[PDB]
Symmetry: none
Subunit: 277 residues, 2 copies
């Protein structure tokens, strides 16, 4: 079994920043992902045991042991689970509007979701695409007051089209990609077709914390963390385990903020490891 003083779990700004600071603290960090002395290992981890004081993480390639652990596995994009949604993923279906927005210059696209994040994808694509169709299951968007007024003006005077009380039933298209989506009325059950070139599913974010369910104090899927103003801010409920980035932040979700907590986690870890004597 591979043993190291520090193990980093993640690959985003939080885990990468933690790796640099850990390496600059001369901790020889190992980073598992799914420049300084950083061993970056490609592996997926299935089971972890935090009850024993050389934390054992079990992955497909090997088993890993560590005296300190930093968790920064990020938050993945929620999906619906349809077969056509799965089929046209990357061929007309996406969750990052910024990554794929430019391909739909002066074309018709659709955005699915009712959260504050879904309106952001619509308002962003509003200036890029000819039309943006916002699909939600309810007749009321659960966003902030400005966002609704931004949407209202864009729905009225602009090119944003509303589709309240609509569940995405199926994604249509040919061998090339998406050519339309089938909406279903949540009230009547009847269908209604929309001819669009792309579909963006922005329904919400899911923290990748399932592997630590019963071993770390969580709250709605997010790792609970000490926080505060007296240091050791990124410590979890288990001594020697620290969380950073999207796995513990459901209010800011910025790269610069995730990089900030990653730095905190590495310094917290350095101070924990330096206390084992």
């Amino acid at each position: 079994m591979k043993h190291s003083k520090l193990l980093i779990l993640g690959s985003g700004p939080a885990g990468y920043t933690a790796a640099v600071y850990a390496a600059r603290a001369n901790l020889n960090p190992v980073l598992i992902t799914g420049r300084f002395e950083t061993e970056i290992i490609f592996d997926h981890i299935n089971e972890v045991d935090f009850s024993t004081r050389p934390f054992v993480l079990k992955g497909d390639a090997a088993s890993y042991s560590c005296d300190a652990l930093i968790i920064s596995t990020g938050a993945s994009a929620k999906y619906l689970g349809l077969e056509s949604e799965e089929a046209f993923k990357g061929r007309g279906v996406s969750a990052c509007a910024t990554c794929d927005g430019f391909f739909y210059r002066n074309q018709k696209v659709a955005v699915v979701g009712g959260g504050n994040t879904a309106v952001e994808e619509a308002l962003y694509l509003s200036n890029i695409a000819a039309e943006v169709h916002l699909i939600h299951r309810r007749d009321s968007f659960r966003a902030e007051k400005i966002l609704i007024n931004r949407l209202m003006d864009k729905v009225q005077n602009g090119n944003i089209v509303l589709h309240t009380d609509r569940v995405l039933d199926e994604v249509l298209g040919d061998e090339m990609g998406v050519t339309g989506v089938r909406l279903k009325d949540v009230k009547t059950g009847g269908t209604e077709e929309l001819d669009v070139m792309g579909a963006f599913i922005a329904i919400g974010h899911s923290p990748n914390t399932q592997i630590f369910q019963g071993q770390l104090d969580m709250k709605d899927g997010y790792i609970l963390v000490k926080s505060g103003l007296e240091g050791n801010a990124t410590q979890t409920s288990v001594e020697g385990i620290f969380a950073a980035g999207d796995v513990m932040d459901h209010n800011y979700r910025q790269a610069i903020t995730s990089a900030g907590t990653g730095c905190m986690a590495a310094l917290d870890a350095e101070r924990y490891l330096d206390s084992l004597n």
Copy 2:
């Protein structure tokens, strides 16, 4: 009296990151630097130490038409809304305030010390300690900050030479215990009854320090690759003293995991950067809270 919907008070990575995110939210922020007004390159490739992160943000903020004002704030009034910031040239008013006045590190005041700042003289071991893997370094200080720095550098440097003006160090219990062990069994060497007489070096960086014996007046030289001045910090919060909840000079903020974490005691007044952080003091952590402060201010102004 010049008014703004949002006022940024500070010229570091915290304030300029708040200015970028505020101008990104079409809040048209105004930034008060704090002072009234040949170069280095390339710098840290990771953008974590040095002025790199602060220089990008300032250029991003100016590229977004952020009004930057060179002025020093004499006093403030946070009782009445909008807030009154009495400056040195003019006064300023705002509906929301972001305070990133910083917490400057204390320096000894030597001419040679100032000459080698950023060229081997540092006040943050976690910022610059990695340049000295398996080398000799000096740490000046006799309090809890110096002991913290000496212990951190002990894992990095070949030798840590801890310089103190008298014969005893005052620090937390467990830190003295670690230092005791490192002094008797490790790579930490004590230099008591010593004052820093001069930092020695060349155009490349620090190569030694000259120490003076406070009991005899005699001098000695230590060959070191870097000198760390660790004698404490000064939160720049004297003008808000009897008006915001503070603690050892640092702005108390809400913190927490439910958002609005940069909120001070007075609603609409937010704090970010070293002014509310005595634990990490990194450019990236100051930038993070600067971003949080700009968002907490945006959500406040929209209500």
